[PDB]
Amino acid sequence: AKSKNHTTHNQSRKWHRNGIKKPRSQRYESLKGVDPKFLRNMRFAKKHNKKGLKKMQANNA
RNA sequence: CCGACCCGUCUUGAAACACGGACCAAGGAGUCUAACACGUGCGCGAGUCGGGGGCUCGCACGAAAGCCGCCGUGGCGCAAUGAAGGUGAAGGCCGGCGCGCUCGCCGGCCGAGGUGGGAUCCCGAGGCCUCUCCAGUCCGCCGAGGGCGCACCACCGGCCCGUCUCGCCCGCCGCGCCGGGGAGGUGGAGCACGAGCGCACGUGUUAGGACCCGAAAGAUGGUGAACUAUGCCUGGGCAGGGCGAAGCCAGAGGAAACUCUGGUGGAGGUCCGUAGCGGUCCUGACGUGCAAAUCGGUCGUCCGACCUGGGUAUAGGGGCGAAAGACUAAUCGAACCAUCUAGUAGCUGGUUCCCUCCGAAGUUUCCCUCAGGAUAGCUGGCGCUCUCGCAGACCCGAGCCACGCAGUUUUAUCCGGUAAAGCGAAUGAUUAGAGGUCUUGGGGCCGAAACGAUCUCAACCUAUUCUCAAACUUUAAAUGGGUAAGAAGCCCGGCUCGCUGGCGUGGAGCCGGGCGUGGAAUGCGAGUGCCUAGUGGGCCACUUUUGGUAAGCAGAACUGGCGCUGCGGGAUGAACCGAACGCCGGGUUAAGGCGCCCGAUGCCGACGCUCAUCAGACCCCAGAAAAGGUGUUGGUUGAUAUAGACAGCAGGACGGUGGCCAUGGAAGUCGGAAUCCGCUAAGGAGUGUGUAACAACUCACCUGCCGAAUCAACUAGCCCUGAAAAUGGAU
RNA sequence: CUACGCCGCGACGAGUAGGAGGGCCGCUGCGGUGAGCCUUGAAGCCUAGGGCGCGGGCCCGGGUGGAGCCGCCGCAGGUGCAGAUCUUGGUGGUAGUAGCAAAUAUUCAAACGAGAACUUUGAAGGCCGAAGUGGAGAAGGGUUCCAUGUGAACAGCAGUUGA
RNA sequence: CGGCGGGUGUUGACGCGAUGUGAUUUCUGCCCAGUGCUCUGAAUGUCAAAGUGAAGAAAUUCAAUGAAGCGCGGGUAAACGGCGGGAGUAACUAUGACUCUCUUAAGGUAGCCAAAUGCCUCGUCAUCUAAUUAGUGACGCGCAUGAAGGAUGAACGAGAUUCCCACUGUCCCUACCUACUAUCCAGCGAAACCACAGCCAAGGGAACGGGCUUGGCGGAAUCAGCGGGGAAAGAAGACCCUG
RNA sequence: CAGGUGGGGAGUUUGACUGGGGCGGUACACCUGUCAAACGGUAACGCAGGUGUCCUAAGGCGAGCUCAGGGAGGACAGAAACCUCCCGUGGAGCAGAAGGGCAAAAGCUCGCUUGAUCUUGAUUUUCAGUACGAAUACAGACCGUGAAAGCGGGGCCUCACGAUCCUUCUGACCUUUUGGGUUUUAAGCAGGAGGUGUCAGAAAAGUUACCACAGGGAUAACUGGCUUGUGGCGGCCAAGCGUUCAUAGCGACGUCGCUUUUUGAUCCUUCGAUGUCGGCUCUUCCUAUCAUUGUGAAGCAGAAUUCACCAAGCGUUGGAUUGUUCACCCACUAAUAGGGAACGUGAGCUGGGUUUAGACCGUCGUGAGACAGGUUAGUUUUACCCUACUGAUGAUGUGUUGUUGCCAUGGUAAUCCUGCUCAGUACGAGAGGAACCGCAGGUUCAGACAUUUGGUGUAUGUGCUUGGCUGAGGAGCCAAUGGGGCGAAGCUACCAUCUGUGGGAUUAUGACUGAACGCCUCUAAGUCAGAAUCCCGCCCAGGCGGAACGAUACGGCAGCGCCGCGGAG
RNA sequence: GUCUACGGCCAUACCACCCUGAACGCGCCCGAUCUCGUCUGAUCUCGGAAGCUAAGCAGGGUCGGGCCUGGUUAGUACUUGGAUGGGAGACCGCCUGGGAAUACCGGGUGCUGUAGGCUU
Ligand SMILES: [Mg+2]
Ligand SMILES: [Mg+2]
Ligand SMILES: [Mg+2]
Ligand SMILES: [Mg+2]
Ligand SMILES: [Mg+2]
Ligand SMILES: [Mg+2]
Ligand SMILES: [Mg+2]
Ligand SMILES: [Mg+2]
Ligand SMILES: [Mg+2]
Ligand SMILES: [Mg+2]
Ligand SMILES: [Mg+2]
Ligand SMILES: [Mg+2]
Ligand SMILES: [Mg+2]
Ligand SMILES: [Mg+2]
Ligand SMILES: [Mg+2]
Ligand SMILES: [Mg+2]
Ligand SMILES: [Mg+2]
Ligand SMILES: [Mg+2]
Ligand SMILES: [Mg+2]
Ligand SMILES: [Mg+2]
Ligand SMILES: [Mg+2]
Ligand SMILES: [Mg+2]
Ligand SMILES: [Mg+2]
Ligand SMILES: [Mg+2]
Ligand SMILES: [Mg+2]
Ligand SMILES: [Mg+2]
Ligand SMILES: [Mg+2]
Ligand SMILES: [Mg+2]
Ligand SMILES: [Mg+2]
Ligand SMILES: [Mg+2]
Ligand SMILES: [Mg+2]
Ligand SMILES: [Mg+2]
Ligand SMILES: [Mg+2]
Ligand SMILES: [Mg+2]
Ligand SMILES: [Mg+2]
Ligand SMILES: [Mg+2]
Ligand SMILES: [Mg+2]
Ligand SMILES: [Mg+2]
Ligand SMILES: [Mg+2]
Ligand SMILES: [Mg+2]
Ligand SMILES: [Mg+2]
Ligand SMILES: [Mg+2]
Ligand SMILES: [Mg+2]
Ligand SMILES: [Mg+2]
Ligand SMILES: [Mg+2]
Ligand SMILES: [Mg+2]
Ligand SMILES: [Mg+2]
Ligand SMILES: [Mg+2]
Ligand SMILES: [Mg+2]
Ligand SMILES: [Mg+2]
Ligand SMILES: [Mg+2]
Ligand SMILES: [Mg+2]
Ligand SMILES: [Mg+2]
Ligand SMILES: [Mg+2]
Ligand SMILES: [Mg+2]
Ligand SMILES: [Mg+2]
Ligand SMILES: [Mg+2]
Ligand SMILES: [Mg+2]
Ligand SMILES: [Mg+2]
Ligand SMILES: [Mg+2]
Ligand SMILES: [Mg+2]
Ligand SMILES: [Mg+2]
Ligand SMILES: [Mg+2]
Ligand SMILES: [Mg+2]
Ligand SMILES: [Mg+2]
Ligand SMILES: [Mg+2]
Ligand SMILES: [Mg+2]
Ligand SMILES: [Mg+2]
Ligand SMILES: [Mg+2]
Ligand SMILES: [Mg+2]
Ligand SMILES: [Mg+2]
Ligand SMILES: [Mg+2]
Ligand SMILES: [Mg+2]
Ligand SMILES: [Mg+2]
Ligand SMILES: [Mg+2]
Ligand SMILES: [Mg+2]
Ligand SMILES: [Mg+2]
Ligand SMILES: [Mg+2]
Ligand SMILES: [Mg+2]
Ligand SMILES: [Mg+2]
Ligand SMILES: [Mg+2]
Ligand SMILES: [Mg+2]
Ligand SMILES: [Mg+2]
Ligand SMILES: [Mg+2]
Ligand SMILES: [Mg+2]
Ligand SMILES: [Mg+2]
Ligand SMILES: [Mg+2]
Ligand SMILES: [Mg+2]
Ligand SMILES: [Mg+2]
Ligand SMILES: [Mg+2]
Ligand SMILES: [Mg+2]
Ligand SMILES: [Mg+2]
Secondary structure, X not given: OOOOOOOOOXXXXXXXXXXXXXXXXXXXXXXXXXXXHHHHHHHHHHHHOOOOHHHHHHHHO
């Protein structure tokens, strides 16, 4: 008839058998969820980075 | 001699008083097809595949093999996206031009962009050489740095299709409700120089009998009334007695009506009782029988709704029923036979060789789900991508020592509201006094008279005071949770922006350059993908904890264990304590032990405590409390004592006063108050006995004899009482 | 140095459900191969015989048997049993046990015969007691009827008797 | 299944068919609200198909009309069924003839009762006994009696119950006898059941052991009985739950 | 063809959780506080509650105010009508449950309004990191408000809700409507709504005692096990009762236990079955003792009674009613104590009760049917196995065999009452009224026995007798023992008769001597008496235990014993 | 040494009462034509400058309340980990680390940023 309802017994052991790994912190996070206005201006800046290349290389030289 | 319970199975737990198994032989259970998915092997490869057909002495093999190529039709792949109409995947640089207006017209090139990682490869200053040197010939190794960067990963761009928002151009044999193009978001199982196709094998899932065996049922078509049930037809049968209906005769009495008496007669779903038919009781016999319903005695009925043969009729959701769901061939709340059918089963049982390696879950979410699934988790297998190097042919290193990770600490830095604490702090609960002064508090005795007054009790206020809170809180731990402890960092410059804006502003991105003491300890090699079984009943212990009187009860948290685990110890035992396991020899231990069983104290072990006429004897754990003891042993506090304690033996224990109010005696003692004085050696106007009451005693108080220590109240060790259960018995 | 081989060093070893690997473990059949084995003795079976392997198992000796069988490389399965109140067959203990007890009852002599409680004959004692344990039919059976012979099996003891 | 098919029916209301109750005697009360059944269609409400009209280019849509049935209206309880409460009140108390109200479709009438029907209950009283949860008689606010079934009443009953006389081995309290067994023998000869087996106490353990631990102890092979155990056998529990 | 009727018939369904199921409840979808052990998460049919709504404002913005309460004042006016001042950290209000939050607020009052609108994505919460719901931050429109900064895409926050399929509506001068075109129609694309409350979402009434199957000890009914609330039995304190007097005998308020003979709680074993009540029969055990033996105490004069100790040896009965366990009554008695053993005991019985199928009544139900309501009728199977027990042969060893014995060990048995005398005695005012020794007998039990009495009787012994049969007499027989009278022997009956026993150590208790503790003291050392108890005797059996003693193998080759350490082995 | 405007932290800043205040300032104050609101020029808005520091405000004071910070409470309460420690239990002791809160007793009573004034 009746039976056990809930437990977390042995659950921690199951969790730690393969380790509780943190998320893989990797360079260049995704731009998901960033403000769209800021993102579109960022895209415009990236697009127009091409101009001023001669000035950039002159300064570098 | 030591060890040793019977296997299989379900189970948290099996040696179980849980089930199956008397024994032996033979048979006996994950198969085949189809479809997927992934992995592996093979061939070819932007293709691949003849499987259907055809051609080849038609055929021992050969029903094979070989070949087709204008037999590649076709399948799958090579293009996606949209419901669809439909549409449908190339960009980067140098420029001259409108106005290089965030854009329109062309050239020259190249051909899927860039950032950060990135095995490998390339260059490489400088080193390693011999008998030595000034001087260059050829190549080998190490090498700081630098370069091109595979696959793959993260990110930023770009392109295709759908759909929104904004907006301006372009095209024409149809100037249109025509067609095309742009920018910015967003939806797609896309593109971004293919990876598929065929065959084989393995695993997993599914449909099929589907691992094997197993229902109660449902449907179709037939066979039965030789038993029984009922109707009909035609036959057969039922001793002996009792009662005595109508009708009748005679005699008698009556005016009649009629009545009385004696016979006669022989009716009746009548009575006793054979045969027959039935079947009450013994709850008899028997109960592996004589018998799958019988036998003995006793019984019901026995001229009738009676018993019975044969012939007929009614057939299964039908019959037939004086009705019991009875009977319908030992079968009836729906017969029997065959078939559909190997029906289905989330349920039970079983499931066949060996060794090696790894090794669980009883938990999350959803489900007409709670004995089941899906899902995540836990498991295994297959790998792949990287890191340290692989060193000297024996030998011999010649500040700095890997990508990265962690059930851990340290150093910083946050987070919290439990334990505790608090209530003279809020919110609730709550005890008792104290001090104040207003009132629809009671009132208060002489106040009415202006309670002339002020006495008490209330309420109220004030300062205190006792006790509390899971659903209170000022304060507030321990344990705990997050983050950081660098090269993705720091610092210099420069460029882009349509975002932001006094500003060369802010922010973000991008491009170069320089910094290595690698910026705590300790340990460890990491990252990543695919497929995937079993499980999804748990239980126990320390501690925390809810319900309950409690429970070997029910429910949670943490860790460990049992399940899945043997071994040493606890005599015995799933969980306790120790410790985890290949087969052995030697040494030593753990926990636990060392009188004998039974290895080891057969030590000249140490110090004490304890006598039980129910002693005691080791975690879990297997039995006890309050309360007592002048048993004994310690300890605490206090008291008395040569100005003679204590204990014994012996005296006084009075006067007022036989004190007052209680009275019917209470005179010291049935009760209420107060505790005087003096004699002194002391005496309570009384600790008890008692007398009706007197009286007579005793005590506390003093004294005498006695001559050295003694007394009291507690306290806690062992022991004892408290302490009663059933077969004889358990450190 | 069978490179699918050989050699060295270090650490490690519990295991249900489950997963994987190896098997010079085992069964049956097919393609190859062993110029394999075999009537001078195959398979199978038995064995206080000798051994090998951790093991699954295997080899050899002895006996019995009397005609086929096996190793290796591949291939393919209706391929391995202690259980399923498993299927079929066989066999134990129980156990020379329960039992051969419903309806009164047999005895004597003789014959046949190897053999007599049971057959036959005679004598005796009983029973059914005419609603029979008598004499005849229907249904049903189907040769059981009758004579002779036998003593295998059957007649739950026996039989010289018998459906 | 079907045919103007068939049974009642070779029949015709003193007949067939369908029900209830159950001889005789005496009775069979009230309720048509409910559910049934039935009668009437009265203007009548609703009401399908078909048919009619209209709109439309048609599909189609709309409207008008309006069969049974249902609603509306009567009847019917020997149709199914049903048949109440609360207060006060008589010159001792106690009851309540009587009086108030609320309510129903009607409020259980005649009868009968601790009945085979009454919980409380072993009701109360009487009788039967020494003693009676039994029996009988009586009472009745009766949990929850009651009229096609109530109440009676001879005869009858393998029906249930109580008492009395007689009778007895039912018993006190057992004994003896007879037949057939059992028993022993000759012959013949099964079956059920069977993990292995079979002496106990306690312990622990799936919380009641034949096995294990600790103790008690243990002597071949057997016969006749026996019913304590083997949680004996017989059947995959029929109770309960789940599917 | 259409509508109605249609359990006559057909098919099917008749949720889940659940300290068994049902009834109850919703712990089934949500929300607050707690549990919850200071991150988060965390369960029970845990506790306290709430929800399926409400709101054109209670949404949005802006402005201006301050609330609850209290104190002091003012005509009617009072405890509460309005006006004024002061204090007022919120003690108010914010729709609702609760928690959090809020003061020139988020509250109150005004003014203007519709951001409760049109859109794409991302994210948080539950989470599998799926959905729904809800929510957060943005971005793009169109707006509202304010001077403006700003704020607003519902409600201050934590809840107030819903897939596929289908339907309905709205939008695109949109797509398709199948050879083409036009127009209706239909289909589609996007967004709302109609709902699944079992709230991740079937379309669903009963009954079965006529029942069935697969299972379940995952799960109740009976034993056992844990617990002991309840039941039962005790203890501690002593306010009181007890003519005075707490404790002779009791024990309020409190409090500590024990027991498993009550009833519960739980669900560990058993559902391929452990036969379920009571009675009968029979044995054993316990003591918390009713009687009896030995004692102590009393509010014990005697008698009777009461309390307590050692103590379970022995006994604890006959009946009416009821199925009863319990109960109650009658009567006897020394007493008529309480219990256990699978609520002992069904292959021991019985079957009255409960608890199958038939049937009647009452109540309930429309009905099938139901009822810890009443009533009546209702199959009780097997032992031959092992052990245990009861008896019966035997077995091992002493060379064989016999006689006579011993005793290890086991069993064990006696019990109670009455009458006479003591004795109308002690004691007592009286009423009443014992005891010790002794005597005579009985009860229950045990072991026998048959002289007597009784029973049996198939000596089938002897008469009598019925029916039949042998021709009759005589003699007999048959009738399953024909019937009956008397009856030997044997067996047998409290239905006759006989017999039934002695010590020891001691318990309780009462004492001696005697310290501890110059006194006392039954105790500490040492002593005494002491019983239905205990042990033994008497009695029953006699060990895989012994003793003493007897006889020990031919008339023929045949066996044996002792002496020899005699020999070879 | 102070003030004003705008603030940051938000009581060491608050609350009650008392004392002092030079110069600027801040205020109180005067008035309602205009702007704008009222039952009321009280508030709000506007136009002013006779008087006043009475009040706000600033500074100081109080064996002041509060608040802040210490000591005590106290290595107490509580607590991580350990034992085949004790005890019938309830609970308690020890080892290993951490470690509070009242009452009670002290000290303190705003600091400061930007801009602009006054103070010989
Ligand atoms: Mg579970
Ligand atoms: Mg099983
Ligand atoms: Mg179980
Ligand atoms: Mg087992
Ligand atoms: Mg068991
Ligand atoms: Mg069983
Ligand atoms: Mg089973
Ligand atoms: Mg079996
Ligand atoms: Mg078998
Ligand atoms: Mg086989
Ligand atoms: Mg071919
Ligand atoms: Mg083609
Ligand atoms: Mg790259
Ligand atoms: Mg990209
Ligand atoms: Mg798969
Ligand atoms: Mg099958
Ligand atoms: Mg069906
Ligand atoms: Mg017939
Ligand atoms: Mg008759
Ligand atoms: Mg008759
Ligand atoms: Mg019988
Ligand atoms: Mg019936
Ligand atoms: Mg089947
Ligand atoms: Mg199961
Ligand atoms: Mg909390
Ligand atoms: Mg606390
Ligand atoms: Mg408080
Ligand atoms: Mg538990
Ligand atoms: Mg449980
Ligand atoms: Mg398991
Ligand atoms: Mg494990
Ligand atoms: Mg282990
Ligand atoms: Mg061990
Ligand atoms: Mg032990
Ligand atoms: Mg060793
Ligand atoms: Mg030992
Ligand atoms: Mg030893
Ligand atoms: Mg004791
Ligand atoms: Mg292993
Ligand atoms: Mg097979
Ligand atoms: Mg086999
Ligand atoms: Mg026999
Ligand atoms: Mg016999
Ligand atoms: Mg005769
Ligand atoms: Mg005849
Ligand atoms: Mg013949
Ligand atoms: Mg024979
Ligand atoms: Mg009739
Ligand atoms: Mg009537
Ligand atoms: Mg009509
Ligand atoms: Mg009428
Ligand atoms: Mg009446
Ligand atoms: Mg009545
Ligand atoms: Mg009755
Ligand atoms: Mg009677
Ligand atoms: Mg009566
Ligand atoms: Mg009357
Ligand atoms: Mg035993
Ligand atoms: Mg079953
Ligand atoms: Mg069954
Ligand atoms: Mg039906
Ligand atoms: Mg916590
Ligand atoms: Mg928490
Ligand atoms: Mg405002
Ligand atoms: Mg917006
Ligand atoms: Mg909001
Ligand atoms: Mg749901
Ligand atoms: Mg269970
Ligand atoms: Mg008194
Ligand atoms: Mg049985
Ligand atoms: Mg049994
Ligand atoms: Mg006693
Ligand atoms: Mg019993
Ligand atoms: Mg029995
Ligand atoms: Mg029985
Ligand atoms: Mg009965
Ligand atoms: Mg019945
Ligand atoms: Mg009967
Ligand atoms: Mg026998
Ligand atoms: Mg003896
Ligand atoms: Mg005895
Ligand atoms: Mg005669
Ligand atoms: Mg004669
Ligand atoms: Mg004769
Ligand atoms: Mg006769
Ligand atoms: Mg006689
Ligand atoms: Mg006698
Ligand atoms: Mg003396
Ligand atoms: Mg003594
Ligand atoms: Mg003595
Ligand atoms: Mg102060
Ligand atoms: Mg500590």
